[PDB]
């Protein structure tokens, strides 16, 4: 791949990416303001990093976020466009560490780091089964 | 609210808390193995901390997650119970901090920290609609 290279990822926040949508089973979340959930932003960031990685992956390969360390310092109503900038910080065998940050056009809404791990998709699928009830 | 206290929170992972459910708008995610998305683990850990600090809010108050720093070291298939243990680490004002960790019954699946800011609901919704298109 290549260290230092920014990758950019644009996404319009729909009404169904707010807090109560993350966990419709949570009574507590049902009464949260209609803003972009942190867990959804995290998902977005992994999504940016997955796309950055895709060309460099062998057929049948994938990745799992192994760590996420970000702030979430400004709220985002549906309608705004969240831009995730991902930057490769290091590659270490199957290990990728990114610097990530996001912006909704008005504010930087969060920034931090995100490590991923390249996996064989089937071997991993098999492994997750010996674990299913 | 007492530093050191512990709140646990149990959750059976349904099928709709997997990666492809965090972002169905992602073709890059539709591949992915049916496993507990990092984005949902982050939310589940926040849900624990929200309940833990529920008895600390005054009326017309809420909380926002303002930082999540956690590992994700094992995959959980739908069917397993994820228990989130939230340990109050600091209460220094409008700011709460937790040490969080999760177990799915077989593996510790992740841990780290999470911070929350007490907010005035009205002023906050007001600031938000100042951002809404």
Curated annotation (Swiss-Prot), chains A, B:
Residues that, per the record, bind CoA: 65, 72-73
Record's protein name: Fluoroacetyl-CoA thioesterase
Effect in UniProt of substituting residue 38 to C/S: Enhancement of acetyl-CoA binding, but reduced activity toward fluoroacetyl-CoA
Function: Hydrolyzes fluoroacetyl-CoA before it can react with citrate synthase, and thus confers fluoroacetate resistance. Cannot use acetyl-CoA as substrate.
Subunit relationships: Homodimer.
Listed GO MF terms: acyl-CoA hydrolase activity; protein homodimerization activity
Record field: catalytic activity: fluoroacetyl-CoA + H2O = fluoroacetate + CoA + H(+)
UniProt-annotated catalytic positions: 38, 46, 72
Keywords: Hydrolase
InterPro entries: FlK, FlK-like_dom, HotDog_dom_sf
Record organism: Streptantibioticus cattleyicolor
Binding-site positions, substrate: 36-46, 65, 116
Keyword Iron-sulfur belongs to the record: no
EC number, as in UniProt: 3.1.2.29
